[PDB]
Write a protein that binds this ligand. Structure first.
Ligand code: HEM
Ligand code: HEM
Ligand SMILES: N=C(Nc1ccc2c(ccn2C2CCNCC2)c1)c1cccs1
Ligand SMILES: N=C(Nc1ccc2c(ccn2C2CCNCC2)c1)c1cccs1
Ligand SMILES: C[C@H](O)[C@H](O)[C@H]1CNc2nc(N)[nH]c(=O)c2N1
Ligand SMILES: C[C@H](O)[C@H](O)[C@H]1CNc2nc(N)[nH]c(=O)c2N1
Ligand SMILES: [Cl-]
Ligand SMILES: [Cl-]
Ligand SMILES: [Gd]
Ligand SMILES: [Gd]
Ligand SMILES: [Zn+2]
Lengths: 404, 403
């Protein structure tokens, strides 16, 4: 029973939920690998065990298990896998699993929100054109003219027969990355691979630094098909600074809706290789990581030149001053556009509250400190001083191999 | 199956084969990672540890399998058979202290590990002689502001005698006076050691920057109270290059960070008193010691003076004030001609260390959450370096407080 201290307050907690940890993580008594981004590498009896555990949680979570629907659902499933080799979730068990998989996501700082989630059941989907319809309705619903609402759309589960639904893009909205004569990139360097695939599947390239890529949606067995997103569907925010008037002339933009489209959803031994989810941004994701990472847009020095900072020496802290101003610009620009955004201070303070609630509810909360602490001003946020236990519970979102 | 380690800024992949040699167990299991915990924590064990260390020493000077190597192993075997313990040679003691520093997974200053002045105090015999050694350490290492890394090693733990201990966690600390209300004047981190100094006969002050006396414990004897000669404690008053009111806050820090309460372990021998010092990375003073809510907690005061909008988080006043406090710290130390390194230079040199160690040893134990500085994390290159945390020996270790 790990003991966990908050060094800002002195308070002590024990994580009894960790005792119930399932699939093994990457660490051993020999060596800790908690900093690695992708740990490890990416008889229908196992199904029944996983299926049984998920039902018990469910009927506990709706307050009373035992006999009743519990014992009947139990063998409806047991008989369905005997008949089918797989089984079907009820609409409500699907809702519960999606919400739990989010609640169990250790690297998610936004989990105070885990109860408010819109689940869109897309398991009756057959065509990639239907995939595109579900996606565009999700995008419409989630964006809500800038008043962002969490949502997930669940496409058909992986069948032992043949097919898998896949969204090839890592997110629903992504800016292209064009390689040039140099070997450098115009646009987003993280997307040079997916931009190439969209090209070689028909898409006609674009001019500049913020071209929204098309969607490459893959229905079972048939290969992926290009789809362009209607531009009035992709809400974007031009970036301006409240007091540096030249900032807007840098022509920076970002999109409103962060929507992950390439992670696998796992619920009671069932696997949904296509279950896009979306929430809203914490401002340091845009301002610090996406615009300032050396291997992303890498604009920090551009901004520092414009601010007349002394870039000749590291001890002027010009990287830090410029970064704070870029984050200011992101927060200002999103507020101006009335698009939902949260700063890292408000987000981390809410995650603290979430830890407190989860301690009473389940006796702990898997949390991955390296991902919860913001990439700027870490120790100025309260999570920096919070010890955390990281472990894997089910249902869960997981990374999967890319379909190429 | 050695761990595959990626640098995401460059796209680089290495494998940490060194971790396979991890000689002591950490707090993580396959069921749960506890990497974020601050304190995770006879005859034949000693000999196997001694043999590994001797083997390391003879690799370092490229004489493995040599006669001198074979002979030193037999010599150590003989001594622990007769006495239950052995003595390090001076050359081995130097190599061991350097190796413990090289192995310290949370230390971002290890590019310097080979430049370490080792003072041998293993013939020390009283608290008074302990205090003499420490003043000579502080003197040598401070060097009028041109800081030099050093360690003084006091006698090893041995059966039938108490340890030498330094009760203070650092050789220079500011007093923290607990108030009636539950507030603190001075450093809250040092309230407990401050209360122990008073009750051992020290007249307190009332300032925010009162330098504590040393409580030195010789074997089997209550700790003794020593006051450092104020001429020995180099301090730096904090000013801001362009915020002239900053100087009026009356903020100071000391030049020399000298950790005095860890245990140094070499070849199975334990040295409970082996204070070491280098120089500060400025975020430790500016961000942690000055802006932590449980430390001096000046961030809101600085922000209000800066006329920042401290009423909403979305103005980023905390981040703007912290940056300027760090600017002041770097500026004041460069002004006072006292060695200091900023977190960009420190992490860039650490990346060079990692590349050196990959070639030399095939890996390098590194605790990510401590190597990433507490502000501007992803602006530094170590943020994007995956790391493996494991325990090698020789090592510095935390040990229970003597009281
Ligand atoms: C609504 C506001 C939300 C905020 C502010 C937020 C914030 C974040 C952030 C900053 C990360 C770090 C990932 C990275 O930067 O690479 C993350 C990870 C993640 N989020 Fe959230 N998120 C939100 C909603 C959601 C929702 C609605 C879901 C799913 C239904 C979700 C599931 C996840 C998952 C699966 C991860 C990766 C977890 C892991 O690898 O352990 N998040 N989130
Ligand atoms: C010369 C410049 C040096 C710099 C810039 C430096 C920097 C640092 C920093 C910033 C930390 C984190 C401390 C904290 O916030 O808790 C640290 C930890 C540490 N340092 Fe260094 N240090 C230096 C020299 C040394 C020397 C000379 C030694 C020993 C001979 C040493 C051994 C350690 C140890 C044992 C730790 C704690 C490691 C652990 O718990 O794993 N350092 N260092
Ligand atoms: N606020 C968000 N931010 C965010 C951004 C990128 C994310 C995640 C979770 C995985 N990703 C990528 C996937 C590829 N690996 C790097 C991270 C969350 C959200 C996205 C979706 C719902 S909320
Ligand atoms: N640059 C430094 N900074 C620093 C400050 C405090 C440190 C450490 C390592 C342990 N400590 C204390 C031990 C008690 N717990 C708080 C941390 C390093 C150095 C100190 C000595 C040589 S370099
Ligand atoms: C090597 C390191 O683990 C890696 O850069 C991680 C650290 N923390 C992170 N935290 C978030 N939120 N997103 C990330 O991509 C990363 N990357
Ligand atoms: C809970 C958390 O591990 C704790 O506050 C740590 C985080 N990382 C740190 N890193 C360094 N270098 N120094 C510290 O004191 C801490 N504190
Ligand atoms: Cl993103
Ligand atoms: Cl310190
Ligand atoms: Gd200039
Ligand atoms: Gd001024
Ligand atoms: Zn671990």
């Amino acid at each position: 029973f790990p003991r966990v201290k908050n060094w800002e307050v002195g308070s002590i907690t024990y994580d009894t939920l960790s005792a119930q940890a399932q699939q093994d993580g990457p660490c051993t008594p020999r060596r800790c690998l908690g900093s690695l981004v992708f740990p490890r590498k990416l008889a229908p009896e196992q199904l029944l065990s996983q299926a049984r555990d998920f039902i018990n949680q469910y009927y506990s979570s709706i307050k009373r298990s035992g006999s009743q629907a519990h014992e009947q659902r139990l063998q409806e499933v047991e008989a369905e896998v005997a008949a089918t080799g797989t089984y079907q979730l009820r609409e409500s068990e699907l809702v519960f699993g999606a919400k739990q998989a989010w609640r169990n996501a250790p690297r998610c700082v936004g989990r105070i929100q885990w109860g408010k989630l819109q689940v869109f059941d897309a398991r009756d989907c057959r065509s990639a054109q239907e995939m595109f319809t579900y996606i565009c309705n999700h995008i419409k619903y989630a964006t809500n003219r800038g008043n962002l609402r969490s949502a997930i759309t669940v496409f058909p589960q992986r069948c032992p027969g043949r097919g898998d639904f896949r969204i090839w893009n890592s997110q629903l909205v992504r800016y292209a990355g064009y390689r040039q004569q140099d070997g450098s990139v115009r646009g987003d360097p993280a997307n040079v691979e997916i931009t190439e695939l969209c090209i070689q599947h028909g898409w006609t390239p674009g001019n500049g630094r913020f071209d929204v890529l098309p969607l490459l949606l893959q229905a079972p067995d048939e290969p992926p098909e290009l789809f362009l997103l209607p531009p009035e569907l992709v809400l974007e925010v031009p970036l301006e600074h409240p007091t540096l008037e030249w900032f807007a002339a840098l022509g920076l933009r970002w999109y409103a809706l962060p929507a992950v489209s390439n992670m696998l959803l796992e619920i009671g031994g069932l696997e949904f290789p296509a279950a896009p989810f979306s929430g809203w941004y914490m401002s340091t994701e845009i301002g610090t990581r996406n615009l300032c990472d050396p291997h992303r847009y890498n604009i920090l020095e551009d901004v520092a030149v414009c601010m007349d900072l002394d870039t000749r020496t590291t001890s002027s802290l010009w990287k830090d001053k410029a970064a704070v101003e870029i984050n200011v610009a992101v927060l200002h620009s999103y507020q101006l556009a009335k698009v939902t955004i949260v700063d890292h201070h408000a987000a981390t303070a809410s995650f603290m509250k979430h830890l407190e609630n989860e301690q009473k509810a389940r006796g702990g909360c898997p949390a991955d400190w390296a991902w919860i602490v913001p990439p700027i001003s870490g120790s100025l946020t309260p999570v920096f001083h919070q010890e955390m236990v990281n472990y894997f519970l089910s249902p869960a979102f997981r990374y999967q191999p890319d379909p190429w």
